[PDB]
Amino acid sequence: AEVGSVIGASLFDQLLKHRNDQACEGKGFYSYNAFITAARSFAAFGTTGDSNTRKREVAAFLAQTSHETTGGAATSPDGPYAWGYCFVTERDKSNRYCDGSGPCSAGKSYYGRGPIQLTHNYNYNAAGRALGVDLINNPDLVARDAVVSFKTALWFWMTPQGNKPSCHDVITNRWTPSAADKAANRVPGFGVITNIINGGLECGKGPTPASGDRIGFYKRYCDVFGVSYGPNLNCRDQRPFG
């Protein structure tokens, strides 16, 4: 019925144990209330399929976003997979990521913000349009309004793009790979969700530390939820889309 039935406030804080560490950027930003309020705008998220598919979707979403925003390393307290949600903004702020063809508001930058590290004027444009907020003229809203921030990540998670299924359709088992997908080893599982998010840099050339970090988060979260991981966790041998 609602995502909170899968993940309560206590469990949210257990998984994202260190997000409000002094070393982290949020200083409260990524609240459970912002998360569940944002999730209400995407009713199917964490409420689709059986009870373990729902747990699995929340774990997959939180694992991917955790990697995007991780403050974790091998020697971190509680390990690398307890440091999700440490960052709100891209460390490098020198690139505006304007494509020169879509709208690009004077003095604004479209570097990574929020749980999925939303990047590029074209994505701020599309996300804002879907959410009913002007993220082209105020992209910083993604770093300042926590509900908006989680909404951009959920928007990304729930929305297909081109030949890419939505991450949602993958983790809920509603995606049937094409023949070319199958030849590329793009079969349903957490691995193809990594591929969707950053396959150009992370997939098709064997193990990478970044995809390994995504998987580490995911297995930790699944273990807490008491759910199996599902098949096809890695994208080592998946051709990037395209």
Automatic annotation (TrEMBL):
<dbReference type="Pfam" id="PF00182">
    <property type="entry name" value="Glyco_hydro_19"/>
</dbReference>
<keyword id="KW-0732">Signal</keyword>
<dbReference type="GO" id="GO:0004568">
    <property type="term" value="F:chitinase activity"/>
</dbReference>
<dbReference type="GO" id="GO:0008061">
    <property type="term" value="F:chitin binding"/>
</dbReference>
<dbReference type="InterPro" id="IPR000726">
    <property type="entry name" value="Glyco_hydro_19_cat"/>
</dbReference>
<feature type="active site" description="Proton donor">
    <location>
        <position position="68"/>
    </location>
</feature>
<keyword id="KW-1015">Disulfide bond</keyword>
<feature type="disulfide bond">
    <location>
        <begin position="98"/>
        <end position="104"/>
    </location>
</feature>
<dbReference type="InterPro" id="IPR023346">
    <property type="entry name" value="Lysozyme-like_dom_sf"/>
</dbReference>
<dbReference type="GO" id="GO:0005975">
    <property type="term" value="P:carbohydrate metabolic process"/>
</dbReference>
<dbReference type="InterPro" id="IPR016283">
    <property type="entry name" value="Glyco_hydro_19"/>
</dbReference>
<dbReference type="GO" id="GO:0016998">
    <property type="term" value="P:cell wall macromolecule catabolic process"/>
</dbReference>
<feature type="disulfide bond">
    <location>
        <begin position="203"/>
        <end position="235"/>
    </location>
</feature>
<dbReference type="GO" id="GO:0006032">
    <property type="term" value="P:chitin catabolic process"/>
</dbReference>
<protein>
    <submittedName>
        <fullName>Chitinase</fullName>
    </submittedName>
</protein>
<feature type="domain" description="Glycoside hydrolase family 19 catalytic">
    <location>
        <begin position="148"/>
        <end position="158"/>
    </location>
</feature>
<keyword id="KW-0147">Chitin-binding</keyword>
<feature type="domain" description="Glycoside hydrolase family 19 catalytic">
    <location>
        <begin position="24"/>
        <end position="46"/>
    </location>
</feature>
<keyword id="KW-0611">Plant defense</keyword>
<dbReference type="GO" id="GO:0050832">
    <property type="term" value="P:defense response to fungus"/>
</dbReference>
<feature type="disulfide bond">
    <location>
        <begin position="24"/>
        <end position="86"/>
    </location>
</feature>
